[PDB]
Design a protein around this ligand. Structure first.
Ligand SMILES: COc1ccc(CC[C@@H](OC(=O)[C@@H]2CCCCN2C(=O)[C@H](c2cc(OC)c(OC)c(OC)c2)C2CCCCC2)c2cccc(OCC(=O)O)c2)cc1OC
Length: 128
């Protein structure tokens, strides 16, 4: 499925090139701009543990999820990954624990050393 495609075909968007965050663009967005650190970003998403049937989704807020990019308001992989998206883009991200919750996890919801998968839509972003 979608995680396997990211493993085989996903681009490594980490600075260290350690495959900690792999990306596939699933729908191309508009324009050339991608958000800067400090910008307020608005997304829809769904997220899964790799090994589990439990899903989280912004569609249940029925509302955009909002955060300021590069301000440690989300896991590292999202500061890295969302920064690469254009407005209207939908991407898949496969995320190793070092760029999420690490060996600690976030118990009981997130286990130790969990890989995560997300589908993310960048709705909009605005300068601070
Ligand atoms: C800088 O590092 C951190 C910053 C923030 C956190 C908290 C979890 C942080 O979660 C995350 O960063 C990632 C990426 C964004 C979407 C949520 N997310 C998650 O892992 C999800 C998540 C994790 C959560 O807590 C761990 C959630 O809160 C209970 C949560 O609620 C909607 C959702 C996982 C859920 C299970 C399946 C795998 C996904 C979070 C959760 C909810 C809203 C957030 O920002 C917007 C807002 O506050 O309105 C930020 C952990 C961090 O490190 C582990």
């Amino acid at each position: 499925g979608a995680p396997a495609t990211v493993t085989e075909q996903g681009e490594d968007i980490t600075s260290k090139k350690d495959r900690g965050v792999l990306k596939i663009v699933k729908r191309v967005g508009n324009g050339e701009e991608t958000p800067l650190i400090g910008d307020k970003v608005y997304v829809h998403y769904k997220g899964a543990l790799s090994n589990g049937k439990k899903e989280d989704s912004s569609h249940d807020r029925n509302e955009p999820f909002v955060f300021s990019l590069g301000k440690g308001q989300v896991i590292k992989a999202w500061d890295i990954g969302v920064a690469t998206l254009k407005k209207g883009e939908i991407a898949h991200l496969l995320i190793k624990p070092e760029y999420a919750y690490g060996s600690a996890g976030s118990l009981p919801k997130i286990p130790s050393n969990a890989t995560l998968f997300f589908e993310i839509e960048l709705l909009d972003f605005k300068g601070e």
